[PDB]
Design a binder for these strands. Structure first.
Ligand SMILES: [Mg+2]
Ligand SMILES: [Mg+2]
Lengths: 129, 87, 81, 206, 184, 150
RNA sequence: CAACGGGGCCUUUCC
């Protein structure tokens, strides 16, 4: 059954990117998906996304701009320490100068750059580049 | 990509597809560059004056180059009722 | 494709799609005012009725259940809500 | 960008209607073409002749944008389009390919072959898949007369027309040649019907 | 009577409307049945960009059904009484804050007291006569979110001219960007 | 889906987006509640109460019109059943299969189906015991299932 | 003067 709606959403976005579609519909569009999409949009990997509110869990339509190489989740959400953030980035990212590891922290969902300049840690949530 | 003191150190800054915004590689021999002549004052097809679109080998192989060209053309003008956003 | 308005699909496409596969799901059924051969009430009947609806003050069947939409007993006048 | 003079006219609109260009393929239509107007009964689909004209004008603009007329190659294997491409390359400075395509004409840089065009026009992608394949090999743009069931792979500019009809084939080629000539300036004003009468492009077996 | 419908400490912000609320009641005895028992509370004015102001008449909302039933017929009377003003009836709904990790324990924080749900009900009360047919939430590239509300074609002609007033009042009440449209 | 099969059915009700009663509905909330209590006194389950209500009347959903679900209304009025309705129907089906099996002893397909139905019953009863609908010592017994269904 | 992080006040809410 459905175990990670964030994983489903990111897989759908990855498939749409690989096929060259400039828009994608994802369901059921949870808050964690909203925050992940917000981080991706703020870093410019996706364009505008709009939340469809049916009285069910909802849907999200994202506009893709072709700048996304790959977004995916890390399941399970491993606990990541300050020293382990660097190891995760080295393992997951194509280069040290771009790409983003996204964490869910007590200060909110944010990328590893914001985590390192806020001196916060948490559980790993995904990546984007 | 540039080094310190702002010098462009990467050779061959590459083109991108006008439909998918992906890089046109040096070996992508299925890609095309479509130039459409400009028109003013009853035609005459001004030589050397073009509107340029890049279509990638992936789009062409998927057969989406036609629809992508329709959309891009109509976005730039050049076509009145061919492409519909809603489908 | 590779560009389409997923947020403003055509009404024809939304009518063609399955009732659950539309952008926002909703029922395709409706309700009907049936004029009974008697009087004193205009009877409300579900389109996809499962029960053989009878008159409040009579003994005629208004509809017979079917796999999908119910029939109308072959004597009926019906308005759609 | 194109004025109402470039816009479609009733005379060539009714010319297309007589040529039956709008009578598209049967319920089998490739789901890559929104060029299908409302579906006519008995299965045949009506092709939007307005979109046909607009795409033909765009393709003509591209052909006229190609600097050297000899670097434009018109390709037809079907007899319904062999005369069309021959007369097209007669009126325009194009290079015709009628009959067999002698595969290796874009690769294989040897004699008797290896034309190097900047553009290729094909009457039917299904029967001219070889030319389209070689164009995809050597970065050649493709304009194709595509019916609602014609494949769109490696086809850049699809002009919707009936390809079961020699009338539609000949008239579409005639219109393309006339319009590209008008862009080139051979025809000074876009009000004359270019008196050369459009039966030069129809195939005649007897 | 103002003394009858006080429901709060008398203030000049609402004295005029509470006095005018008696005149139609006196001149329309047939409206006594549905208008007599209902009673309102503090009313505040929201500036609109078109130089107008909107009177958000708040009610403690035990008896919101009465205002809903009589609202379509005294709204026009109220803008006739005083122009340059858009009159809207809102409920007064308590918000309980979401309990924190170190907060004290209160009993279960009913879902009707949540900030999201009360804002949805505020928007419904704002557009009472017209039923909402859809909602969307647009997250711009800049980072701000705007809520689009899709309204049905039926009965919308009583609010078609005060949609901007609705938007201004909602933005003042919440700080959240709203846009109304009627999907045709 | 299809807990005890390979089916992939998706057919279900698609209740409306609107959370309010339709504009053409004029019956009172108390009137529909009285109809509900009358049907329950007649002895109908909530499911068929809702079906008959929606068919012979204009009530699209007692939940949207009366503001309460049908089983909740029945419990509030003191007409709640001794066991939940779905568990009751599962136990009735299990009784029917067990009786059909004790006749003629050779329907191995019936034995398999009875195993499936009893597993379903045990899962539902476990859920009900966890949510405290059923007593913590409640136990489904094949020997008394008939005496419990009637 | 720019960016980044920290804290507090109302906004129906408290440290
Ligand atoms: Mg299982
Ligand atoms: Mg399924």
């Amino acid at each position: 059954t459905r175990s990670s709606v964030l994983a489903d959403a990111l897989n759908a976005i990855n498939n749409a990117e690989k096929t060259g579609k400039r828009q994608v519909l994802i369901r059921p569009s949870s808050k964690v998906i909203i925050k992940f999409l917000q981080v991706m949009q703020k870093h410019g990997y996706i364009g505008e996304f709009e939340y469809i509110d049916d009285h069910r869990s909802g849907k999200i339509v994202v506009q893709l701009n072709g700048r996304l190489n790959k977004c995916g989740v890390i399941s399970p959400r491993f606990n990541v320490k300050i020293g382990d953030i660097e190891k995760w980035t080295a393992n997951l990212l194509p280069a040290r100068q771009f790409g983003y590891v996204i964490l869910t922290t007590s200060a909110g969902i944010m990328d590893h750059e914001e985590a390192r300049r806020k001196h916060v840690s948490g559980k790993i949530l995904g990546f984007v580049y | 990509m540039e080094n310190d003191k702002g010098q462009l150190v990467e050779l061959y800054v590459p083109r991108k597809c006008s439909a998918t915004n992906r890089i046109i590689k040096a070996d992508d021999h299925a890609s095309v560059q479509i130039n459409v002549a400009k028109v003013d004052e009853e035609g005459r097809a001004i030589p050397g004056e073009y509107v340029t679109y890049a279509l990638s080998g992936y789009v062409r192989s998927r057969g989406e180059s036609d629809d992508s060209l329709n959309r891009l053309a109509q976005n730039d003008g050049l076509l009145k009722n061919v492409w519909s956003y809603s489908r | 494709v590779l560009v389409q308005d997923l947020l403003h699909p055509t009404a024809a496409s939304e009518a063609r799609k399955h009732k659950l596969k539309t952008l926002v799901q909703g029922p395709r059924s409706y309700f009907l005012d049936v004029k009974c051969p008697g009087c004193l009430n205009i009877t409300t009947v579900f389109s996809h009725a499962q029960t053989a609806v009878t008159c409040e003050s009579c003994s005629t069947i208004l509809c017979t259940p079917t796999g999908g939409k119910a029939k109308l007993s072959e004597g009926t006048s019906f308005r759609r809500k | 960008s194109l004025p109402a003079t470039f816009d479609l006219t009733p005379e060539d609109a009714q010319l297309l209607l007589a040529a039956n260009t709008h009578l598209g393929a049967r319920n089998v239509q490739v789901h890559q073409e929104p060029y299908v107007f409302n579906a006519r009964p008995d299965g045949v689909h009506v092709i939007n002749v307005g979109k046909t004209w607009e795409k033909l004008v765009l393709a003509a603009r591209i052909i006229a944008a190609i600097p050297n007329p000899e670097d434009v190659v018109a390709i037809s294997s079907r007899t319904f389009g062999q005369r069309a491409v021959l007369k097209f390359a007669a009126h325009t400075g194009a290079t015709p390919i009628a009959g067999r395509f002698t595969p290796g004409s874009f690769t294989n840089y040897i004699t008797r072959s290896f034309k190097e065009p900047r553009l290729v026009i094909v009457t039917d992608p299904r029967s001219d898949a070889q030319a389209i394949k070689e164009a995809s090999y050597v970065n050649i743009p493709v304009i194709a007369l595509t019916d609602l069931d014609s494949p769109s792979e490696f086809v850049d500019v699809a002009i919707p027309c009936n390809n079961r009809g020699k009338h539609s084939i000949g008239l579409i080629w005639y219109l393309l040649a006339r319009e590209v000539l008008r862009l080139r300036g051979a025809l000074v004003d876009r009000t004359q019907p270019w008196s050369i009468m459009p039966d030069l492009y129809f195939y005649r077996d007897p | 009577p103002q003394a009858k419908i006080l429901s709060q400490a008398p203030t000049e912000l609402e004295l005029q409307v509470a006095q005018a609320f008696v005149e139609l009641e006196n001149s329309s005895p047939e409206l006594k049945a549905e208008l007599r028992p209902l009673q309102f509370k503090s009313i505040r004015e929201i500036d609109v960009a078109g130089g107008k102001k909107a009177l958000a008449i708040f009610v403690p909302v035990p008896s919101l059904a009465g205002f809903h039933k009589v609202q379509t017929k005294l709204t026009r009377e109220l803008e006739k009484k005083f122009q340059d003003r858009h009159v809207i009836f809102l409920a007064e709904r308590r918000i309980l804050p979401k309990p924190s990790r170190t907060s004290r324990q209160v009993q279960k924080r009913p879902r009707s007291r949540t900030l999201t749900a009360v804002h949805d009900k505020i928007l419904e009360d704002l557009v009472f006569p017209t039923e909402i047919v859809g909602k969307r939430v647009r997250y711009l590239v800049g980072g701000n979110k705007i809520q689009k509300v899709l309204l049905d074609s039926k009965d919308v002609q009583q609010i078609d001219y005060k949609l901007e007033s609705f938007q201004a009042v909602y933005n003042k009440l919440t700080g959240k960007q709203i846009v109304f449209e009627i999907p045709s | 889906g299809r807990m005890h099969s390979a089916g992939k059915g998706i057919s279900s009700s698609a209740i409306p987006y609107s959370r309010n009663a339709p504009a053409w509905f004029k019956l009172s909330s108390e009137s529909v509640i009285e109809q509900i209590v009358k049907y329950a006194r007649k002895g109908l389950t909530p499911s068929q109460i809702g079906v008959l209500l929606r068919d012979a009347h204009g009530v699209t959903q007692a939940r949207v019109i009366t503001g309460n679900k049908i089983m909740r209304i029945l419990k509030s009025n003191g007409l709640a059943p001794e066991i939940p309705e779905d568990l009751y129907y599962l136990i009735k089906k299990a009784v029917s299969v067990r009786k059909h099996l004790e006749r003629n002893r050779k329907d191995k397909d019936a034995k398999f189906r009875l195993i499936l139905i009893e597993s379903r019953i045990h899962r539902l009863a476990r859920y009900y015991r966890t949510v405290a609908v059923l007593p913590p010592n409640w136990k489904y017994e094949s020997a008394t299932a008939s005496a419990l269904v009637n």
